[PDB]
RNA sequence: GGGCACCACCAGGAGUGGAGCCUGCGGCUUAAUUUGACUCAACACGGGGAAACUCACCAGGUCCAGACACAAUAAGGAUUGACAGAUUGAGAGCUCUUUCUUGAUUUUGUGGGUGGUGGUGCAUGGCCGUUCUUAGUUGGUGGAGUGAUUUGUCUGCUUAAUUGCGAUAACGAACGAGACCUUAACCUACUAAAUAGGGUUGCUGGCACUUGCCGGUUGACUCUUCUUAGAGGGACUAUCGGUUUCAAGCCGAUGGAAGUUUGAGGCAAUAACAGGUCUGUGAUGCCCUUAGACGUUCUGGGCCGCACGCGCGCUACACUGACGGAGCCAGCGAGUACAACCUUGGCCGAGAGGUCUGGGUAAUCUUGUGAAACUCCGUCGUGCUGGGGAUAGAGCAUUGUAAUUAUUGCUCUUCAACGAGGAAUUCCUAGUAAGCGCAAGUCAUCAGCUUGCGUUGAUUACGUCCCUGCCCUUUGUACACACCGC
RNA sequence: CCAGGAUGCCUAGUGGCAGCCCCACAAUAUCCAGGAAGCCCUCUCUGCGGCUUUUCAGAUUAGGUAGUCGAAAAACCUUUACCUGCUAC
């Protein structure tokens, strides 16, 4: 046979940099409580935007938003 | 369904020849030969050839009933309109596909090969076939191939009695070493086929003549 | 010495080899122009006419399809997903920009599999090819040998045949050949038909115009010759003549549909070959490989490149023609409902091809596949000419996602080589050869290929061992891996 | 690769529908047998296949030996030959 070509760059899939207990939600009171950024219009609430500059998200639909919040 | 009479036929052919693929694979513990299709209006009616019936059976409607499933799930049919049965063969050693299965087991279970074939003929010989004749090729012992030859009585090799009188059966055999190919011709004596002629085209058998006296004066005998 | 064969030659035909062009195979070239196979028995073969797929090759990227076993994270996430533009060949989340999802599938290891058009056909199966479709092969007694063995299985003559007749330590047998089977031929003799064909007659079109001629209509009635295709017969070398130890047979006339094994095949022994195929194969041994794969999968190429060799092939070198009209006749087939098949009939278009409509799952419709080569009357007359059609340029079409490295078709234009091809060598003995087209196969699209089919239809043998091969016999053999020997 | 200059019988031909109208058959020698491209060859304008090599390997296959092929610098214009592979109830 042919031998192998050899560039060298490899490309493996990430691993994700996974973090779970994440920093978004509040409470301050106690009794109630206060949710930060905002909750998917499409689907119903559980679900949470993406923030970014003036750009948003969701995954439950992949990514299906447009307009800023 | 609605096709061209001779697409159909064909058809039905591919799938019967798909059924005996089926089998040959499936019921090799339970020793099957062949299967027979008849295909009447509402239900089907596909019998099967197999040394251990019972087996084949399961327990009152089992294995059989899986069987039937399966088909059913393959070729778009519903419960009811397949119907199988399990019957024994008249004369296992006249059959041929059986004879192969079975060489095929004993060789799997370790046996002396040229023993068993020997032993195989006998078994044909007894059950009443003309003659009869095993290839067992590969590697029996060494590397280089050598094909094995066992064979009794006659064995017609040229013209249209071959497919009328000899039963062939073909059965490649998987071992740790590597393969062994099996072939087996049986050639049913001409008196018990049945179908088709019941002897040889060329062989002709000229009756015995009858004795008369001659003469004994001219008479009568009047009523 | 004796046989046999148009894969041998005679007597002839058609040729190929030359010409151009197709296509195989070398050689070179190329990232890569994937591989298998080289006397017959490699080279239009791999059903191999590759546009991607196929595909194995190259450049590049993607994906796990890493079964199962056992631990490291075991939700303070294992890993799954992920629009936006840069990214990217690229609306490949291929990722690095990102900060949202996903919930124990996985996943990180370690046993363990799995896949591979990876390797080895000189590790195998099966199938195929070839010795060989030649006439060969075997054993039971019995005889000859201490024996391996031998005879039978053979001087002769026959036969396509170890086919027979004969002669005979051989007798009777089996396999192979033959028989067999299928098909191709005959049936005014049977059984049959508005899915096959006719006859009378109804209505009905035209004629001559007497009653008669051709028609068109599934209107009626009836038939089975042709049709089909069931059952049977029929050919057995039959009758006669010679010829031959008056045997096997062969040769000639007669009749007969048939007198070449009636023609053609299908199968086709023993023993084999280091023949081919591990690129048909969930046929497979072992090796290799085995998660940036030699697995897969996308994308773009490549098998098609060209100083040049040979091999199948087509087209022509014209006047037995070419071109126009006109005449106008086959047989094998094949053909869709979950697809897109054959596709008449009507209109558009010089064509190709479009369109509407049907008919057909098919002796019904395509289809009488009114196929060509042919036949008739005219135009050019023996000039590289209107022979010949290559290379060329352009446009019009179609198939498909994609046509440049013209896919193919059509339209105009360009008009090259080649005045029957040297040494060589192929094929052939009757509905054959050769010509001619059709036909399916592959097929989305492409025929110069192929398996069949019919149409037109000859020349010359009907012998021989000169060559070639093969077979036996007798001989010789320091060979037995067997002359590529020793 | 070449061509005829003229001493001459040529001969105003013989055949086939002679007829002019085409076909074929008939005219010794030739004297020269001569010219053009190519012509044994040697230096140049200084060529691409040798020289060794060292790196490897393609492989050549059933296995192996000896040679040969392929990618990198220096003057000169073959993939074959040969060794070795197997047995009774
Ligand atoms: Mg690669
Ligand atoms: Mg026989
Ligand atoms: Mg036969
Ligand atoms: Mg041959
Ligand atoms: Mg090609
Ligand atoms: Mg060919
Ligand atoms: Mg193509
Ligand atoms: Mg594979
Ligand atoms: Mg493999
Ligand atoms: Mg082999
Ligand atoms: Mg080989
Ligand atoms: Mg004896
Ligand atoms: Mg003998
Ligand atoms: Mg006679
Ligand atoms: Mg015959
Ligand atoms: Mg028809
Ligand atoms: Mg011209
Ligand atoms: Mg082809
Ligand atoms: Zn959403």
Do not use: W
């Amino acid at each position: 046979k042919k031998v192998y070509t050899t560039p060298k760059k490899i490309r493996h899939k990430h691993k994700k940099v996974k973090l779970a207990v994440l920093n978004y939600y509040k409470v301050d009171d106690e009794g109630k409580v206060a949710k930060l950024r905002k909750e998917c219009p499409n689907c119903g609430p559980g679900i949470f935007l993406a923030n970014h500059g003036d750009r948003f998200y969701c995954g439950k639909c992949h990514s299906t938003f447009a307009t800023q919040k | 369904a609605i096709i061209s009479k001779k697409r159909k036929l064909v058809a039905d052919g591919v799938f019967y020849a798909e059924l005996n693929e089926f089998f040959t694979r499936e019921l090799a513990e339970e020793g099957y030969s062949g299967v027979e299709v008849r295909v009447t209006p509402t239900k089907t009616e596909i019998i099967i050839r197999a040394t251990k019936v019972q087996d084949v059976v399961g327990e009152n409607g089992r294995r059989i009933n899986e069987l039937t499933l399966l088909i059913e799930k393959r070729f778009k049919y519903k419960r009811g309109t397949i119907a199988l049965y399990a019957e024994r063969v008249h004369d296992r050693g006249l059959s041929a596909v059986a004879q192969a299965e079975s060489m095929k087991f004993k060789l799997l279970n370790g046996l002396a090969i040229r023993r068993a074939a020997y032993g195989v003929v006998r078994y044909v010989m007894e059950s009443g076939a003309k003659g009869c004749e095993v290839v067992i090729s590969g590697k029996l012992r060494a590397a280089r191939a050598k094909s094995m030859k066992f064979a009794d009585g006659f064995l017609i090799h040229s013209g249209q009695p071959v497919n009328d009188f000899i039963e062939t059966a073909t059965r490649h055999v998987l071992l740790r070493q590597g393969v062994l190919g099996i072939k087996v011709k049986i050639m049913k004596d001409p008196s018990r086929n049945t179908s088709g002629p019941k002897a040889l085209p060329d062989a002709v058998t000229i009756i015995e003549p009858k004795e008369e006296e001659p003469v004994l004066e001219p008479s009568v005998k009047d009523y």
